[PDB]
Amino acid sequence: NGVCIAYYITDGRNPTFKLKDIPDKVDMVILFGLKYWSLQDTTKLPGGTGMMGSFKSYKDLDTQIRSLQSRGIKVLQNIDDDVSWQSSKPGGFASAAAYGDAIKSIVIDKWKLDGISLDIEHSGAKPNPIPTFPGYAATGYNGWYSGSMAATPAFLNVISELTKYFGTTAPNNKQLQIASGIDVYAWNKIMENFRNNFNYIQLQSYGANVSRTQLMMNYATGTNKIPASKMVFGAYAEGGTNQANDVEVAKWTPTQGAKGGMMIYTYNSNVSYANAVRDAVK
């Protein structure tokens, strides 16, 4: 009985399925598409347009978030890694600490959200040297995803600071999750430093079958030393074609033991598909 984490992409797709319509048996919802700077300054992106396409206004967004929270559903904000994370001025702020304070201020202090999920896969400087990727048998991936970036000290500093406000060692039960892949350059170092801080570690195993997710588990647990209970696999509801496999993975218990659960990308993209995966994991 793992967790069921729902991504709700805020681009206005399937508009009749509102954020507040997330059904029961869904533990958390991650606002995706919408950017943290929009939460920071609500005047730049008009409601009902772009990444606010799913809401009539910011008041509508705010009201719907509370509807979910009062039902006991945790609402998290997605935050993408960025090349500025490899710089001394992450997110334009003066330091990683300033950046950390800023995210806490916007996500927690202002919007009263339950945490953040880091989508780690964006471009930036690659590691030097580039290690030889372990390969498919060892990880469930063929090689490096060349569009990702190195977890340089500056990059790790950002996550370290976020760790003071989000995650297992931070106060006020705030979620800190990561959505990435073993094929992302930054993966290994992120895990060496913060695996224990993440409540959940999501693998973007979209379209995988149990065999493949098990290869991932072997590595995540054995080599990255990640507790099996934090592992969450990705159900690509948006694709609408891998439901049977996703359901198998949802009900599946890795050889390493009970996994954390499943995340659905995106719940609002295909509700029937999402409901099926939710049912399977619950």
CB burial of 32-54 (b: ≥16 within 10 Å; e: otherwise) equals bbbbbebbbebeebebeebbbbb
- Bridge partners (DSSP) of residue 6 are 29, 264
What lies within 8 Å, CB to CB, of 75 at 6+ separation is 28, 29, 30, 31, 65, 68, 69, 113, 114
Q: Solved how? A: X-ray
Q: Is the distance from CB of 11 to CB of 272 less than 8 angstroms?
A: no
Using DSSP, state whether 232 is helix, strand or coil: strand
The alpha carbon of residue 111 and the mean position of all alpha carbons in its chain are separated, in whole angstroms, by 18
Q: Which residue has the tokens 């979209």?
A: 206
Q: Which of 121, 161, 192, 238 is catalytic?
A: 121
Task: Delineate the domains of the chain, giving CATH numbers in brackets.
Answer: 1-282 (3.20.20.80)
- Pairing mode, if any, of strands 261-264 and 231-235? parallel
Q: Are 248 and 281 in contact (CB under 8 A)?
A: no
- What resolution does the deposited structure have, in angstroms? 1.8
> What are the residues whose beta carbons fall under 8 Å from the beta carbon of 115, sequence distance 6 or more?
74, 76, 77, 107, 166, 167, 174, 175, 176, 177, 199
Distance CA 206, CA 220 (A): 17
192 catalytic? Reply is no
Query: What does the alpha-carbon distance between residue 38 and residue 133 come to, in Å, rounded to a whole number?
Result: 37
Q: Read off the amino acid at residue 173.
A: N
Phi, psi of 110 (to 5 degrees): -80, -60
Alpha helices in 41-173 (DSSP H): 58-69, 96-103, 136-139, 153-162
Q: Please give the distance of CA 249 from its chain centroid, rounded to a whole number.
A: 18
